[PDB]
Every structure is written in structure tokens, then in C-alpha cells.
Design a protein around this ligand. Sequence first.
Ligand code: 9OD
Ligand code: CL
Length: 117
Amino acid sequence: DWVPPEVFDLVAEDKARCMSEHGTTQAQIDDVDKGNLVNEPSITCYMYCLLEAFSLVDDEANVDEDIMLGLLPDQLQERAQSVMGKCLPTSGSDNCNKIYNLAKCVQESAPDVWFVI
Ligand SMILES: CC(=O)CCCCC/C=C\C(=O)O
Ligand SMILES: [Cl-]
């Protein structure tokens, strides 16, 4: 669980662009999924890049919560909305680092569900 496999097809093109743009390796992504976050631009800008690709964030890494909730499964919307109370607004020294700070907040608040694609 829980991401439907269809989402991997849907993000494939943007994922390859984002990894190429930022020098991201799958190993870095697999490590964020296992809960290990580091402030490395190659992974933090990748997370911003992918989020942007789907209008989840804007040009200053403000999260669009309406879009985020509508995109999440109908079950998680409870948790989600609660974690956005704690973790939004995003904060940091640049768009990438604002997403690093977000990621570790959400990792921390919901390890059960936490995931990056
Ligand atoms: C890096 C990460 O997990 C966030 C990407 C979210 C993309 C979801 C896009 C479309 C959908 O879920 O239909
Ligand atoms: Cl700021």
C-alpha cells in the first residue's frame, strides 16, 4: 500500500526530467522512502521539482492544500489535513530547502504513510 501503481506511469516523464535536472539517483529516493532525509540539493530539489510538476507547490514552494487533498486517497485526507496544520506554511532558505523542512516534518508526523516517489 497505498499508492496506486497507475501513479508511477503518470509521473514517469516528470520524474526522469527532475532526476536529470537535479542529479538525483533512485538510491537517494529509496533512502528518503526508508525515512532517511538529508539536506542534499540533488534530492531536495528533486522533491520540489516533482511536487511542482503536479501543481502541488508554487514558485516559492507554497503548498496548494486543495490540490494536495484532492489528489490524496480519500482515506488519508484526515491525517493529511492534520499534518498541514502542523507543517504548513513551508519554511527554509530556498524552494528546495523549504521542501526539505516539509519532508522531515511530514516524515516525523506520519511515518506510517510517509512516501516519496
Ligand atoms: C515525490 C512525491 O511523492 C510527490 C509526487 C506526487 C505526484 C502525484 C501526481 C499525480 C497523481 O497522484 O495522480
Ligand atoms: Cl521565508
